[PDB]
Design a protein around this motif. Structure first.
Motif: not given
Lengths: 57, 57, 57, 57, 57, 57
Positions: D18-24, D26-27
């Motif tokens: 979840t952290l990888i998808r939500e940050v990507s 957001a970027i």
């Protein structure tokens, strides 16, 4: 958490200000961690300092 | 693969362009990975921002 | 010069040894720097820690 | 863009996914960049390797 | 300030605890910064991941 | 050991010169390692490139 994002130069102050907040929110949401504990570092790279496939972007 | 190389400032654009390609080729050769998947980040350091043995270079 | 190379885990010690030598020789070549002054850091990434497009690659 | 996120170890693979998808996302949102061009690196920190104020947090 | 210290693995938790406190106090001293604002990251390197002169040191 | 310290811009050359030496000494003391083997990298961040809690410092 501590996030360092390597981005190409050319963005404005507003886009990078949005980048810090939205990424910090995504880290706080995904990890259920306090937003105040999230730190974000933006590192700009000149066009001559980033390569893809051995060639400049 | 993603490679970040910390080098001292003073090199020209050509030496850093050669650096990105030759390193990306060495990574692609040694790992049998596609050259197109290799990314290289060049980070320049000022003389006052790099130390060896507690002293400036 | 100092190089940190992020790679997906799974390579053998012999391949990661080849990666350190070939990259160091490439850095020393492009910058005309003393080979003994070049240091390489290998940072392995689990398949669960690397993403491309928000998806685990 | 390339993001390296230092977090304390202990999260599940589902949370770090979840952290990888939500940050990507957001970027890609803040910079108007192609999602497929965004890469995220998760670097876990043991409780014995992270300090706040010289004390292990 | 945020410090990431790459060291060869093998140190005890007591030594790496000493490393975090002594470095944080050194950073707070030199910059006149609040100690509680200083964070230190310890990144261990296997003997197979660190090279000096293309040779594993 | 190799230490990279992310600090906010605005410090003088003298404070950063003290930072490199005192940190290298603290690393050499805490790890009983030769001072000459310690390298320190100072990375300056602009005010618009560092966030705390999703907001600029």
């Amino acid at each position: 958490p501590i996030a360092q994002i390597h981005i190409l130069e050319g963005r404005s102050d507003e886009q990078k200000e949005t980048l810090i907040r939205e990424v910090s929110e995504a880290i706080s949401r995904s990890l259920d961690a306090p937003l105040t504990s999230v730190r974000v570092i933006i590192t700009e790279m000149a066009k001559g300092h980033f390569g893809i496939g051995g060639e400049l972007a």
